[model samples]
Target: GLVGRGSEGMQFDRGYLSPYFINKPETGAVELESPFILLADKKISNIREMLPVLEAVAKAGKPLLIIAEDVEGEALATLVVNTMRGIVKVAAVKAPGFGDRRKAMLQDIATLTGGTVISEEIGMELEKATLEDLGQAKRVVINKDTTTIIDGVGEEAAIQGRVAQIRQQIEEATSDYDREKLQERVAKLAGGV
Candidate 1:
């Protein structure tokens, strides 16, 4: 589901982003309602850089869905521990794709959810990210292979803008194969869940 356009309005996932880090038995699939999402363009490996957000989410009493390039090191471990202790309800998933495409797709998601993409290229630091930088959806479900975001809080006009942008990308694509894939994105963005 992460590799291609999803079926729902904002469907996407799998790989259990961090199965080993979690303690639950058979943590293969998960469904979250009204979750707050964090979209990052880089790996999250340090607990220090992640602590503030973790505490903030804990205070908010909402589930946190982290979509980033990778979640590793002490950061991943601490998340699991905190989750097990019921301090925070959270799940981590690796952002799909690589390099520029990955960044573009992530940006699409940000536009769809009305959130900011945390990237150094834009002078945004993860440490400085706040609740305002996060995205919200009515529901999000993910399995070992796919994630789906339903009923995004993003405004309709912004969503349409992204669809138009993708359509332009389709026209500019040099390869039919690439164009076909871009078309899938347009369908996903424009189609209702």
Candidate 2:
């Protein structure tokens, strides 16, 4: 039913909007005898369907830029790099108050991707960094070939830093058992691999 609706929606009077136009209108139509149809009929679960036709749509040769805000931005960047095996271009913009943690995550992603991260404090007189700087920064390769080599380094570093900060709270806590247990757990977690 969903596929039927989708196909109907695509059949605009002027023909499907695209960079290439074919003479046979049925060429773009989803036939009932297609493999997609067969799969729908079978009602399979967790099946890895190979839809080469759909995948080819991304090869249209147009640059696809996605901008996401906050945590979504970090997630989207990760997904794009993982799915497309592409490099990320990052630009850092400052916000008021104690800098945004999401922005820091963006900068971290940029660093991991070997992209440039620039800082611009509001109202501070400084030469505005250009996109050229981003081009010049080192580019980190993201793919199956290189992902394993540096696995867990960034996350481990962050965890280590957070644990160190938490250690300072042990002395301030009034509950002795809670403080001792917390310290012990932290130590146990951080012990040599």
Candidate 3:
């Protein structure tokens, strides 16, 4: 229950968002399909800077995770277009770095997205990346200030699946001793979903 803004800011047939919140007491997850890739190793604040990134997003045809100095101007519009076209499922995260160090930050981000950070060190910018340059993920969850990698899409489902099993164990445990142990475990597992 947030985000009260001008009608122009709200553009949708129905008024809602793709929620990235709650496991329990929260919201929805900014879900990304597997293989989240990054197209830029630097900030994109200008229209010119975003063009290459837009091109990369179109090329990937999969969800792309972007770590940028900032995503603004015409580039942001390009991202919306790309997402609508199924060209790429993207979640843009602001990279935490400045100047020369931005490249290194992107390198670390490569691990998160399951993609490699391509910079001049490899004598190439990600703009030149083809489909092969993309990385893989089971899914990705983006929040207000973080990008989370889910090793696979079924992780939560698997975890949720086991809760029933644990509940059965708790239910069938005739002895108080067995019930206590299983119940404790069930409590831990239940919160995970």
Candidate 4:
């Protein structure tokens, strides 16, 4: 099938990450338990900017799930080393979509998990981020080409509001491609995950 399935989670076609360490069952897959989801719209390119948040999550005794534009260079290398060393259990994935659509998709995930998108435009900084700034889910499963967020701990009101907003966008969409994408967002938002 072109798409995948889940029991109670939002299944998105992203991830496909190669964890430098093999802590999980699969070689490239990252399986997290009671993870703190951090959604960021910018590239995680520096360790100095990421260490504080990593420390916060480790101190809290929970795994960190990073969904950012791109995790590269030293930041990614450090995360891999820390994960293998048991300093901090974590996984990093590229955020879904491209350009403006990527921002929207990150927002949707933030709303779903009750986390704030670490966007510089909104004056948010990853270095200053804490556990409160992140979202929580029962579990997360990341494979070669998909990531599933199970039982997101977001408020129903917020999720409903997001769904309605996407619905409105779907109605106003003129291009068939745009409408199709909008519809997909709505389904991912409302589809019992």
Candidate 5:
């Protein structure tokens, strides 16, 4: 999980910081401008520089797992999935949050990748079990032979059903918002899917 840290430093106490601040020319005036101004002016360029790093990491056979919170989760999951389709073997796991939209997006990714999307409640149980009964946990294997194969398929189908259900929840949640904007974002996100 990419949580429990101030690692990225994208977010600050006041608000989001401009990535351009780190790359500005050595002029004092440019360095002294408000972070918001720099962000508004050159955010795209900042993102462009970041793409290469992400691409290199993906190409290096690393398993990238992005955990995003709130609204960011949906967009981040979409980006990770879309980018990993052919470039890398990526599996994204999203944690449950306040609204169902976050979980909905997570479910979508799990359905696409044969991954798991356990809710925060169940996730806590898993974490506790992992810590308490180590040997028993290791022995609790998900069988993938014959009977297990059928069971796995059934589980996957159930996950797909859950995805559909959550997507409906998302639609209900965002119904009051700007439909055109939501559609545009979704269309862009679903570009290669």
Candidate 6:
């Protein structure tokens, strides 16, 4: 992507500002960072609700990236308090949607981000989340509109597991046509695209 149009006092270039071009760690099947997303659909109303959300990530020692539609008021206040500590870096963002639109969007974020999607739909008890419930990422760059992750943390094994999950769902599908069409996705996910 082009940086922008340049004036006499400015400049424009591609690959000059992208993270991988200048990422903190230049990975090559070497060690990489991972994501841990907290997907909450309900409004957070108390300081206590935010505690375990932050605590879970800290316990895992994984970089945190919370994905929530409702992160404000006391919820936001709690984070601000934590941020006062030195070297505290909490990465987070919100996925778009509500009602049915959000139902699929949240699941897609888990797939797209390669992180566990935590919410009631998934039987996720956020306060009781284990480290395994957190999402995985090879690298995490949390920004205003979105959080980008270089996802090679678990690599092929993790993807194969997801494909298997999809296969099971295909078996339960209502139509042979659905199974075949979804099987294509299994190959695609396994294709490492």
Model 3, residue pairs in steric clash: 19-28, 20-28, 21-27, 21-28, 22-27, 35-137, 43-69
- Best model number under TM-score: 4
Question: What TM value does model 3 have?
Answer: 0.51
Question: Candidate 3 residues 1-193, lDDT tens each?
Answer: 4326421110101111222221222544355665445546555555554456556655655556655556655666666665666665666666554565455445434433345555645576545655555555566556554455445222455445555665787788889986775564444333222
Clashes of 3: 7
What's the lDDT for residue 135 in model 4? 91
The 10-residue segment with the lowest total lDDT in model 3: 7-16
Candidate with the larger TM-score of 1 and 4: 4
CA lDDT of every candidate: 0.77, 0.26, 0.50, 0.85, 0.29, 0.51
Off by over 4 Å in 3: 1-28, 45-61, 84-87, 97-102, 111-114, 120-123, 152-193
Q: Please give the ranking of all candidate structures by TM-score, highest first, separated by commas.
A: 4, 1, 6, 3, 5, 2
The model with the greatest lDDT is: 4
Arranged by lDDT, best first: 4, 1, 6, 3, 5, 2
- For model 5, what is the error of residue 168's alpha carbon versus the real structure, in angstroms, after optimal superposition? 6.2
lDDT of 6 by residue, 140-167 (tens): 5533233344542444655566677777
- Find the 10 residues in a row with the least total lDDT in model 2: 32-41
Question: Is candidate 3 or 6 superior in lDDT?
Answer: 6
Clashing pairs in 1: 9-193, 12-147, 13-145, 13-146, 13-147, 14-144, 14-145, 14-146, 15-144
CA RMSD per model (angstroms): 3.8, 20.4, 14.3, 2.7, 19.1, 10.7
| TM-score pick, better of 1 and 6 | 1
Tell me each candidate's TM-score: 0.88, 0.21, 0.51, 0.92, 0.29, 0.56
In candidate 5, which residue pairs clash? none
Question: Between 1 and 4, whose lDDT is larger?
Answer: 4
- How much is 166 displaced in model 5, in angstroms? 7.6
Among all windows of 10 consecutive residues in model 4, the one with the lowest summed lDDT is 16-25
